[PDB]
Amino acid sequence: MVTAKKDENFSEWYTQAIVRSEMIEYYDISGCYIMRPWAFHIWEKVQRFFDDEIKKMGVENSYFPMFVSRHKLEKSPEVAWVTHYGDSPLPEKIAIRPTSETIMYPAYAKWIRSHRDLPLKLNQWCSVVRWEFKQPTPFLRTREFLWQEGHTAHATEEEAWELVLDILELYRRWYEECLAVPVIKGEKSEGEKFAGGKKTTTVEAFIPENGRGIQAATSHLLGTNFAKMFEIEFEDEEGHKRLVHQTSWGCTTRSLGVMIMTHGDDKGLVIPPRVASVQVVIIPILFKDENTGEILGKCRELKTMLEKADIRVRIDDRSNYTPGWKYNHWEVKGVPLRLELGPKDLAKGTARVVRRDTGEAYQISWADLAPKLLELMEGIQRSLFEKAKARLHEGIEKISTFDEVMPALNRKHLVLAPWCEDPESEEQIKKETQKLSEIQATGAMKTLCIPFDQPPMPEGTKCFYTGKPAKRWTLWGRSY
Amino acid sequence: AMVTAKKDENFSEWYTQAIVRSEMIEYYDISGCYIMRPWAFHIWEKVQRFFDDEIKKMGVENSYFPMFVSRHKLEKSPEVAWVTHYGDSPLPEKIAIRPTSETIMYPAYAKWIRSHRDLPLKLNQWCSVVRWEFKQPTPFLRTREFLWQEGHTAHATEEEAWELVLDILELYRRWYEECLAVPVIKGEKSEGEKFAGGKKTTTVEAFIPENGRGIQAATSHLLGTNFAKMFEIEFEDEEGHKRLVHQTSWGCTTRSLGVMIMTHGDDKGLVIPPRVASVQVVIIPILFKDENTGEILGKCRELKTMLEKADIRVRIDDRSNYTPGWKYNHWEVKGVPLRLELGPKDLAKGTARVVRRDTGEAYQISWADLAPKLLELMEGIQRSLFEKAKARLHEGIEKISTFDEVMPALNRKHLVLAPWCEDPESEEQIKKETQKLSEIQAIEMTGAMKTLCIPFDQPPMPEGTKCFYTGKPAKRWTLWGRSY
Ligand SMILES: Cc1cc(N2CC[C@@](C#N)(C3CC3)C2=O)cc(NC(=O)Cc2ccccc2)n1
Ligand SMILES: Cc1cc(N2CC[C@@](C#N)(C3CC3)C2=O)cc(NC(=O)Cc2ccccc2)n1
Ligand SMILES: O=C(C[C@H]1NCCC[C@@H]1O)Cn1cnc2cc(Br)c(Cl)cc2c1=O
Ligand SMILES: O=C(C[C@H]1NCCC[C@@H]1O)Cn1cnc2cc(Br)c(Cl)cc2c1=O
């Protein structure tokens, strides 16, 4: 049972939702959490979608070591260092991977020798470790987390940039098509991009209850800098030695946290049908032996028919729990549809179906069950996305001048503002907004992204902070 | 680009050449760790899909537990890797990288299990583990870091747990025999060889004829209640008394790829069974550089589309800057089970030439006949690969009566099946005796013979049969040999 209200104390609500639904368990090492099966099911679904999609692009999976030698990593950072095997010291300490550039690119330098070898497109599913001192949040910001990382090498910059954009569109689909979470595609600012690359692109999500943006996934154009550092070169069709043009990209189980925060309500989780391991739960109403074998035989009959429409169905015929307990259990876990079958329903040839997202109840004849449920699930998925998109739209304010910023931040909104893109000004804006928030008593505003979808920039439009010529419309807000 | 070491002359150099020249592995500067390149990883993906699909029907659910365990939870030093520092700062308590996840999972089991309604609890996880041994590593077979799955279940009764132990072991038999076409023997480990944390260890064992060695392929343990005692994993039963759960654990690793490589490979390189080959059919246009007109590649595309609508895994090697013969050798070293050749004559006849990797036999096939024919050939290659390997397994096991038969059989690079009293002291004695006799032989890996398993499939034990070593009453036929 969830008792905290989402719109009152959001942090207590989130903790309740993910504990009481059995998504997470705590662990004695700070910043690490156990991912229980109810959460892991969702990860498996988005992993299958993304993996299928990158394979059609020619990306192949691989597995590189979890350890990197001190002198290879440092070609200290907040990495976990292994210094001993048993009681014996290693002659050189080794780190646990925070990301695998230093592990993979020496191999790329060995494998790439001619244009015949390109493009090289690899991905791996693994976990990484970033041992930060700060407060962790389950799914969103943890010390160890699951994440794929893709790394590619190309003969030209244009082919690399094309892949960057293709991958970022896959991340838009991971969020919007699977998880029903709306995201904004954009470029990172110069101060916010990956330092080892040329251009970083991102999908950004918005959490209306605390007003914060959160980076959902990222796709980098690395250019040739790592090719220089690692000596990744190839002979072109005319004999000349050239540097490769690289990309890298990743997305994590943070996606699940964003889903939970987007669609959850006062009763617990709400799982979008496309990633629900159980789409429909059938609950036999058993009491005083009122037509028991009748009811359970019928439930089995219904499961088989729905499955023949590829609906993912679970009968909760466990005998150790009451029907009321089952209603609340599957509601807190977010199953899209609950189908109730009792003696009355069997006498009438119908089932009672309740939608998780809106609570609406439907009396459906057995014959109609499969097509109707399909309609409902399409309806649920679509409505989850559309409601979320409306909230995203209501949470962004277009502004012209800096004087509008603090009122907007106080409404827990993001701002879209014309910006000159000077890196000094982003540093100044972060400092000023933090100071102002402090005085009104994590308050800094930073750039979230420069969106791909740019409204026109009228000639003569001035930067909202510096008064210099504005270049592009930029999304700002408080953030994770 | 070609394998030159012969499998039956210098097996270790053959194995290294096969897995490097096929682009399955890459070396790494940290000893005992290797990079798993896509040609190998695809196979792992296929066996992972099979096993995952099968355990899900048993109600096992996947999960993910942390890779780290606190010093005081692991030591509830071992050969584990210890993290002692974040950046330059010491941890107040060092933490180990998981060598297996019992000490990470079972405290959560103790929290989750309170009543009989909570059972059975059935979890699995796919992850990597680390065992920092100082012995020489072998790619795929024995490494410091390896991918695996490990499953862990808890039950209200011993009979239910034992049923699951046996169901999982049958899945491991199918992983090897049905996916990888490797024959394995199901058996029970001896008291000295079982997992000390458990009551009974079952195994599937494989055999490598070229070096005469047995190798453990996968394992499934009946843990009993010992871990339930240690972690206080108890439940209130249907009548209200606290009871210990009965547990199982089981695991299988990428060692299964190394066993497959050693079982089917030949002097030309790898041979990949069709059921796990990421490319089942490579189409090689007989086309030379700057000669592409569109005729050959156009038909190659039409053929690939047709074959794919039969769910055949097809690749066209249309790479412009390699000759067709180079391509033939490339994909032979990689073990692609079927090569489809398409050149000018094939176009002029409406046929294609298909060559199977395992035997080299060639077939002329009409375009229209390709899809069913290739399906048939692949079923034939899989079956044949398995049936030849099973024959070698059978030729490699000698049934014996007395200890004096043992050294001759080991010198033929064979395993022995022998009646055994099952006394643990005698297995220690046999290991030492065979090691010393091997040493003396070698003057004029170790030579010790150990138990591999006590097979499930037991021939009758005639009344009065004596143990081949102690002369005491024999209990069960036991499989022994030199081992990994
Ligand atoms: C679960 C998760 C996710 C992510 N990040 C990063 C950006 C990214 C995106 N987009 C990655 C590129 C894919 C993402 O998801 C990052 C993290 N931990 C951390 O920062 C370390 C940490 C540990 C304890 C407290 C505070 C911080 N934890
Ligand atoms: C690749 C792989 C596999 C396996 N093992 C174990 C038994 C088992 C079986 N069956 C596991 C239960 C599943 C298996 O496969 C074990 C290993 N490394 C090691 O012993 C550590 C090591 C490191 C360097 C040199 C020598 C030894 N490396
Ligand atoms: O991890 C990255 C860059 C990219 N790597 C490939 C997957 C997508 C990802 O955005 C940035 N990054 C982030 N955090 C890090 C923390 C440490 Br500790 C180190 Cl050494 C290095 C890094 C580091 O390189
Ligand atoms: O890892 C095991 C027992 C079982 N765990 C679950 C998967 C199947 C597997 O056989 C035995 N084992 C093997 N090697 C180990 C190495 C170290 Br180091 C430690 Cl601490 C512990 C162990 C250890 O417990």
Q: How far apart are CA B209 and CA B139, in angstroms?
A: 18
Pocket test for ligand 3, best of A99, A198, A226 (most atoms within 8 A of CB): A99
Q: Tell the burial category of B188 from Cβ atoms under 10 Å away from its Cβ (0-12, 13-18, 19+).
A: buried
> Per the domain annotation, does B387 fall within a domain?
no
Q: What is the CA radius of gyration of chain B?
A: 26
Q: How far apart are CA A209 and CA A392, in angstroms?
A: 11
| Pairing mode, strands B213-224 and B246-253 | antiparallel
Verify that A246 and A287 share a domain, yes or no: no
CA dihedral B299, B304, B305, B306 (to 10 degrees): 90
Q: How far apart are CA A56 and CA A33, in angstroms?
A: 33
CA dist list (Å): B455 to B204, B386, B451: 9, 20, 11
Q: How far apart are CA B311 and CA B107, in angstroms?
A: 45
> Per the domain annotation, does B313 fall within a domain?
yes
Contacts with A35 (C-beta within 8 Å, 6 or more apart), sequence order: A23, A24, A43, A146, A253, B63, B64, B65
Among all bound ligands, the one having the nearest atom to the CA of A143 is: 1
CB neighbours (10 Å) of residue A341? 23
The reply to whether residue A27 touches residue B81, judged by beta carbons under 8 angstroms, is: no
Ligand 1 atom with least separation from CA of A254: 1
> Distance from the CA of B142 to the center of ligand 2, in angstroms?
5
A71 contacts in chain B (CB < 8 Å):
none
SS3 B121: strand
> Per the domain annotation, does A67 fall within a domain?
yes
For residue B223 the two structure tokens come to 């843990």
At B170, the amino acid letter reads E
Verify that A171 and A55 share a domain, yes or no: yes
Across A61-89, b (16+ Cβ under 10 Å) vs e yields bbbbbbbbbeebbeeeeebbbbbbbeeee
Residues contacting ligand 4 via CB (< 6 Å): B 78-80, 99-100, 131, 150, 195, 219, 249-251
For residue B408 the two structure tokens come to 């001759």
- DSSP assignments along A412-428, one per residue: T-EEEEEE---HHHHHH
Please say whether the beta carbons of B292 and B348 come within 8 A: no
Domain boundary among B329, B353, B379: B379
- DSSP assignments along A255-284, one per residue: HHHHHHHHH-BTTB----GGG-S-SEEEEE
Experiment used for this model: X-ray
Please say whether the beta carbons of A480 and A195 come within 8 A: no
Residues contacting ligand 1 via CB (< 6 Å): A 31, 130, 132, 134, 136, 141-143, 145, 147, 215-218, 250-254
At B393, the amino acid letter reads L
Q: How far apart are CA B420 and CA A164, in angstroms?
A: 64
The range of the structural domain enclosing residue B438 comes to 397-483
> Distance from the CA of B141 to the center of ligand 2, in angstroms?
7
Verify that B52 and B142 share a domain, yes or no: yes
- Relative orientation angle of helices A37-56 and A254-263, to the nearest 10 degrees: 110
Verify that B368 and B430 share a domain, yes or no: no
Q: How far apart are CA A357 and CA B9, in angstroms?
A: 68
> Per the domain annotation, does A365 fall within a domain?
yes
Q: How far apart are CA B216 and CA B232, in angstroms?
A: 31
Q: Is A31 in the pocket of ligand 3 (CB under 6 A)?
A: no
Residues contacting ligand 2 via CB (< 6 Å): B 32, 131, 133, 135, 137, 141-144, 146, 148, 216-219, 251-255
Please say whether the beta carbons of A480 and A141 come within 8 A: yes
What's the reported resolution, in angstroms, to a tenth?
Answer: 1.7
Please say whether the beta carbons of B420 and B469 come within 8 A: yes
Q: Which residues pair with B285 in a beta bridge?
A: B342
Q: How far apart are CA A413 and CA A207, in angstroms?
A: 9
A118 Cα distance to chain centroid: 30
Verify that A296 and A242 share a domain, yes or no: no
Domain boundary among A245, A272, A299: A272
Residue of chain A minimizing CA distance to B117: A320
At A298, the amino acid letter reads K
Verify that B245 and B303 share a domain, yes or no: no
A320 membership: H or E segment, kind and range = none
Within the 69-128 window of chain B, which residues sit less than 8 Å (CB to CB) from chain A?
A: 69-70, 73, 77-88, 94-95, 97, 108, 111-112, 116-117, 123, 127-128
Q: Which residues pair with B90 in a beta bridge?
A: B85
> Distance from the CA of B422 to the center of ligand 2, in angstroms?
25
Q: How many domains does chain A have?
A: 3
Pocket test for ligand 1, best of A18, A141, A188, A261 (most atoms within 8 A of CB): A141
For residue B231 the two structure tokens come to 């972690």
Name which of A69, A127, A131 is nearest B86 (Cβ-Cβ).
Answer: A131
Verify that A108 and A34 share a domain, yes or no: yes
CA distance A373 to chain B (A): 24
> Per the domain annotation, does A216 fall within a domain?
yes
B94 contacts in chain A (CB < 8 Å):
84
| Pairing mode, strands B281-285 and B314-316 | parallel
> Per the domain annotation, does A386 fall within a domain?
no
Please say whether the beta carbons of B292 and B283 come within 8 A: no
Q: Which residues pair with B341 in a beta bridge?
A: B284, B353
Verify that A157 and A75 share a domain, yes or no: yes
Contacts with A324 (C-beta within 8 Å, 6 or more apart), sequence order: none
Q: Which residues pair with B459 in a beta bridge?
A: none
Q: Among A393, A411, A384, which residue's Cα sits nearest to residue A475?
A: A393
Contacts with A258 (C-beta within 8 Å, 6 or more apart), sequence order: A139, A140, A175, A179, A181, A205, A207, A214, A216
> Per the domain annotation, does B385 fall within a domain?
no
Verify that B52 and B190 share a domain, yes or no: yes
Contacts with A340 (C-beta within 8 Å, 6 or more apart), sequence order: A283, A285, A323, A351, A352, A353, A354
Verify that B322 and B421 share a domain, yes or no: no
> Per the domain annotation, does B386 fall within a domain?
no
Q: How does DSSP classify residue A135?
A: P
| Pairing mode, strands B397-399 and B415-420 | parallel
Verify that B353 and B453 share a domain, yes or no: no
Verify that A2 and A68 share a domain, yes or no: yes
Domain boundary among B247, B273, B299: B273
